[PDB]
Amino acid sequence: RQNLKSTDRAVQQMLDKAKREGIQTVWDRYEAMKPQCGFGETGLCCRHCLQGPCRINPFGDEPKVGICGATAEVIVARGLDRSIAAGAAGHSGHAKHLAHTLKKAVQGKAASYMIKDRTKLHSIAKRLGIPTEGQKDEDIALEVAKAALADFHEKDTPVLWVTTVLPPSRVKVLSAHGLIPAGIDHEIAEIMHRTSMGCDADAQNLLLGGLRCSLADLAGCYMGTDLADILFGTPAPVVTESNLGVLKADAVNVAVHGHNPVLSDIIVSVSKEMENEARAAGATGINVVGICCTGNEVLMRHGIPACTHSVSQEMAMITGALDAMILDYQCIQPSVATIAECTGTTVITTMEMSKITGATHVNFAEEAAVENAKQILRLAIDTFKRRKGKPVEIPNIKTKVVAGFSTEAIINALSKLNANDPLKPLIDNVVNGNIRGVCLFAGCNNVKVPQDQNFTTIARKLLKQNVLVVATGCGAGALMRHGFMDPANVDELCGDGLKAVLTAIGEANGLGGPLPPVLHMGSCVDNSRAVALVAALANRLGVDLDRLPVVASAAEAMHEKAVAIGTWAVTIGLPTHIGVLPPITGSLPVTQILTSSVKDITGGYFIVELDPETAADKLLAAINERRAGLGLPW
Amino acid sequence: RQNLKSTDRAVQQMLDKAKREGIQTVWDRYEAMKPQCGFGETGLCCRHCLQGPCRINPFGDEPKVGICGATAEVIVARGLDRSIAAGAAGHSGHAKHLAHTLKKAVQGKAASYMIKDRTKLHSIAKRLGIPTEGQKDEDIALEVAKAALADFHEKDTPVLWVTTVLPPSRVKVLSAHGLIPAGIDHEIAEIMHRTSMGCDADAQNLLLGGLRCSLADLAGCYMGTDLADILFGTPAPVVTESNLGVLKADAVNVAVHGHNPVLSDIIVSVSKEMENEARAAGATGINVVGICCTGNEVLMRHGIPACTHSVSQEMAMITGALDAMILDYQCIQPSVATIAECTGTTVITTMEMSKITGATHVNFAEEAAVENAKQILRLAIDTFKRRKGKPVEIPNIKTKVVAGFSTEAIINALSKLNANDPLKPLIDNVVNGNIRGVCLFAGCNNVKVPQDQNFTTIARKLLKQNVLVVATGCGAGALMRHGFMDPANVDELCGDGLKAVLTAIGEANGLGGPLPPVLHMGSCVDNSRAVALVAALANRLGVDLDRLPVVASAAEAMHEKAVAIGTWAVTIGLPTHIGVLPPITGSLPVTQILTSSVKDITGGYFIVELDPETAADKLLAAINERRAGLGLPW
Numbered sequence A, B: 001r002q003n004l005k006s007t008d009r010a011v012q013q014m015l016d017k018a019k020r021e022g023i024q025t026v027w028d029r030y031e032a033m034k035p036q037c038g039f040g041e042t043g044l045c046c047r048h049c050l051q052g053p054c055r056i057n058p059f060g061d062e063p064k065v066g067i068c069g070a071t072a073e074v075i076v077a078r079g080l081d082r083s084i085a086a087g088a089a090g091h092s093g094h095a096k097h098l099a100h101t102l103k104k105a106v107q108g109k110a111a112s113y114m115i116k117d118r119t120k121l122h123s124i125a126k127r128l129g130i131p132t133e134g135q136k137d138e139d140i141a142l143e144v145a146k147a148a149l150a151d152f153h154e155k156d157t158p159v160l161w162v163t164t165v166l167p168p169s170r171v172k173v174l175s176a177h178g179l180i181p182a183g184i185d186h187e188i189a190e191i192m193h194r195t196s197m198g199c200d201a202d203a204q205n206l207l208l209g210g211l212r213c214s215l216a217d218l219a220g221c222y223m224g225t226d227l228a229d230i231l232f233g234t235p236a237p238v239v240t241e242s243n244l245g246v247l248k249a250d251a252v253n254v255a256v257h258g259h260n261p262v263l264s265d266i267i268v269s270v271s272k273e274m275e276n277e278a279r280a281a282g283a284t285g286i287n288v289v290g291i292c293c294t295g296n297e298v299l300m301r302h303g304i305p306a307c308t309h310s311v312s313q314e315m316a317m318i319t320g321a322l323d324a325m326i327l328d329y330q331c332i333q334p335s336v337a338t339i340a341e342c343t344g345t346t347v348i349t350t351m352e353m354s355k356i357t358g359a360t361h362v363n364f365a366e367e368a369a370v371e372n373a374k375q376i377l378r379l380a381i382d383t384f385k386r387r388k389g390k391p392v393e394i395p396n397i398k399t400k401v402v403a404g405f406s407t408e409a410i411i412n413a414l415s416k417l418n419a420n421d422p423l424k425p426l427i428d429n430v431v432n433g434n435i436r437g438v439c440l441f442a443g444c445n446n447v448k449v450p451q452d453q454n455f456t457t458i459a460r461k462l463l464k465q466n467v468l469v470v471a472t473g474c475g476a477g478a479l480m481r482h483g484f485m486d487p488a489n490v491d492e493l494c495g496d497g498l499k500a501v502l503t504a505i506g507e508a509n510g511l512g513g514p515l516p517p518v519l520h521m522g523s524c525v526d527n528s529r530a531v532a533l534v535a536a537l538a539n540r541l542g543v544d545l546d547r548l549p550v551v552a553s554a555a556e557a558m559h560e561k562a563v564a565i566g567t568w569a570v571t572i573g574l575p576t577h578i579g580v581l582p583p584i585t586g587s588l589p590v591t592q593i594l595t596s597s598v599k600d601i602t603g604g605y606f607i608v609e610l611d612p613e614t615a616a617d618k619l620l621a622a623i624n625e626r627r628a629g630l631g632l633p634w
């Protein structure tokens, strides 16, 4: 039975435990929701004013139009635009938090934080045009943080975290269509305005606004990665493990869940100090483990093992060994606060704008990060003690994970084959066919799709066709939990050409073995790292991104953030697969813009395909079409 | 039949014409939508991620909770918060537009605009703390415009268009609850973040965020009024007319519809220049008439007659005499673009973010306002010529309207009774019972309510109980179209005490007659004028706004902007009636917060009441409770 819910064996085992214990899960709540509303599924519902709710029958007779006259086209486009703005609001709110934290750190107001990556700080300053010669690091960083904050509002320049991160030719194409954001929060607000009742009512105009707001989301992502690297270190290759078997019955198990490394990075460092305090309580130590993006952040930088991801997050609690779940914001099922009553887990919120009824709230202030962390960890230690003598059921299931492939690390790895032209070995192998193209897997799991089934099915076909696969967020989580980040699986998973390249790079890096089958490029904001890599390739080749054999797949998408990311992938020029239905099919004109005529605007386009084998074929076709456009064999 | 749709006779006549001509109206589209979705009506629907749509049965069995675990409380509060943010995005986008226009004007970049009200400019600068002594007006205005723009983002001060417009004691109460906005667009974005999936999931916390975002909406409203007064003149009493009978078969009839006086003010002035050009085309002249808020703006400042409002806007076109409908944004039924095919009206959009498929778009640039206006008006003249010899059906129905009661004008009128303490005559008459209290009517019509029936039913009962009634937006539109702004109706409509006061003020102003039964305080952003009046009363009395016998009624609310306004009315301390159901009844805890326990936070509260006689009784009870709290008879 449980295989229809998740393809992860550890998740299946915990689903069996939840069932016999009567603990309701996300899958049970989904079953209880069926059949879901077909107006909502197709996008043909509007609640943007108190004359509503309005709906439109996909087919048949009336209602055919909204009460104010809004057509199916308008309703669908307005709902989509609001989702893009909501995603932009999340990624950029994360980035804004980090910008204020950096400012505080270098103003002397938060001594738990510091410039850890001086090289990253100077390179960002150079990219932005901020002078470094003869300046103190703290002054350079103050200027970077102020520039970050300035990109949220209108000013004399557009959003620099768009215009300084894409090639000039791409910026020119976007500017010609009016798509460069003027300010991050400015664009979010303009979306909410133009989609309110009696405002924008032309599908093309609305969708152009959405594309521009998606670039505000990209700017937030890139800003988040940049600032987190300065504060916490740019990732480099690291070896760790994933899945529920990383929990340890004899340790205090603490999950960091949510998004921002401002919180999870301090938890990691403070946890090591309190080891002896944990031992006094009868534990071996504090075992910090990751869930969702903030787990990815500490996996990428510190090798903290990943417990689980996205849709299966409740299953970590069902083991009975999760003593604490420490939260900041985004992608946290609020069910965790009630499940904790039955599992014993202490669920702790820390951010003023993200509370859950029934969860313990411990305000976290960057100015008091270490002390606030100790208060939180001491709640976890008390919880470990309370479970003295209780059996736990930790599935003895884990994989080996090689990760930490920031763009800097990928360039460094390649530089071992060509020191002064590090991108050339990659391009050479694209040209000779050893690498067919590149595919970025991104985004969530979604309860509608058996967990991980689309990521793994698509990835397997692409890897066998010599596609270089990179991954972020819970797409990276899916692939790591299924062995795709273990170099021991290269022979099984990779075509001969891809294997040759991964082996050549690995052996040049002293590994006596290959790079892993899939390169983990980090959290969801770290989709911006894939942008940096692709933009660097484009610049080295002297072509725009919409000529490169690079595609993206949000194969099991869920969050509004994933819609925003998919939309900016299209906007920067990529064929972009989405493996769940976004609420667009109720308007053929809108679907045709997003899947076809946007090619004429940005060169990218959505590929909506729920069958993963077919999605892989379509992604391969998109890659091979790009190869043919460059005059390459395929 | 038509009386169930609208209580306005002119609207009824045009509904008969639309019916025999087969032209579908908002009322027909509403009928086609019935029965509307009960999940949406109650707030128990969520589409915030691609696992949805989710719904919760108001009563009965499953579904009882959203797929991610979101409760009814969370779902209802998140939807409400998004509506507040959308309203804030509209009012503040309007204000932002005006701030950029003022900046351009005084930088020499838009010579069609200028500082028209020097007195207002200096008083705003003084309120904000901007020095004026020894400064050029253009420099003072540059500083005001920059301060306006700065309130959209975080900075070293909170939003000054909140903190400098409410009494210190009210700011202190709000600050204690964390409710002062940090930046207008900042708060909009934070709402969209915290309401996205897996973020804020505590109803009280979510609603506190909503209250804070409503204050960002108030700041946008107040900023909009302030800047429009500087650019276009602070209103003073003016006499005009309203309803469809203000159209003239032998003139070029041009409706200004939407919101921003940056557009409608120029149309008014340029139209007078082109009179002879219109006469050459066989017209008597150009007859500019108003619809919705931008109509209110030019009615308040110039006495431009109001044609119609809100829900009945299509009926102006049905006359056959509306040659042009000139739009910027907000509250425009997009049906107008298709109805125009059948009526001959030229519908013209002018703003980049607000287009309607099938409508002619004429970009308007403040830098070219006069020329762009002439292009627009020449389309209208061509349209008049095309209807040579066609019969029109203009209902011969109009009322007399005295309006222009800005807060400055109200203070000036009262100063004729007490020159150096102008608020005292008003307070004296509250104390002696000649004025029972004050009621602000605000907001839209809504197709669910027979048009104007709640505004007029409630207003009549309050006026008979000696309540001083003020009105804005389409509440003012409803009341003007039913004679409530004609001083000749004071004897019929007003209790003896109110009549005595209106007569005493009018006779002291040289009128030989009373002020009108209802004081028109302007457009919906000009709800901020009512705030200025109430805050001035509070300061003169040394008490906070939640002790004053002042209430608000959004008696037929529709737009997200009306939800935002109602919410900030509650947040500043007022009992606030809403005469349509907002999507809250699916959560009793949320309803109880908004109608009861918020009293303990801000002193205000919502009164949700769809029966207008009962609503009037509840508003009177709220007024009389405030009187009793002040130790006054009632």
Ligand code: SF4
Pocket: A046, A047, A048, A049, A050, A051, A052, A053, A054, A066, A067, A068, A069, A070, A196, A197, A198
């Ligand atoms: S905006 Fe138009 S379509 Fe949407 S709920 Fe209001 S009347 Fe219906």
Ligand code: SF4
Pocket: B046, B047, B048, B049, B050, B051, B052, B053, B054, B066, B067, B068, B069, B070, B196, B197, B198
């Ligand atoms: S956010 Fe939760 S309640 Fe809303 S659609 Fe997604 S799963 Fe359903």
Ligand code: F3S
Pocket: A292, A293, A310, A311, A330, A331, A442, A443, A444, A445, A473, A474, A475, A524, A558, A559, A561, A562
């Ligand atoms: S952290 Fe969230 S946005 Fe998707 S990628 Fe994972 S569920």
Ligand code: F3S
Pocket: B292, B293, B310, B311, B330, B331, B442, B443, B444, B445, B473, B474, B475, B524, B558, B559, B561, B562
């Ligand atoms: S202009 Fe719009 S917000 Fe309501 S008050 Fe009139 S319908």
Ligand code: FES
Pocket: A037, A038, A039, A040, A041, A045, A046, A053, A055, B037, B040, B045, B047, B053
């Ligand atoms: S009618 Fe179901 S989503 Fe609105």
Ligand code: FES
Pocket: A037, A040, A045, A047, A053, B037, B038, B039, B040, B041, B045, B046, B053, B055
């Ligand atoms: S189920 Fe009808 S509004 Fe969503």
Ligand SMILES: [Fe+3]
Pocket: A259, A292, A293, A331, A473, A524
């Ligand atoms: Fe994430």
Ligand SMILES: [Fe+3]
Pocket: B259, B292, B293, B331, B473, B524
């Ligand atoms: Fe309005």
Ligand code: NI
Pocket: A293, A443, A444, A473, A474, A524, A559, A561, A562
């Ligand atoms: Ni994500």
Ligand code: NI
Pocket: B293, B443, B444, B473, B474, B524, B559, B561, B562
């Ligand atoms: Ni309004």
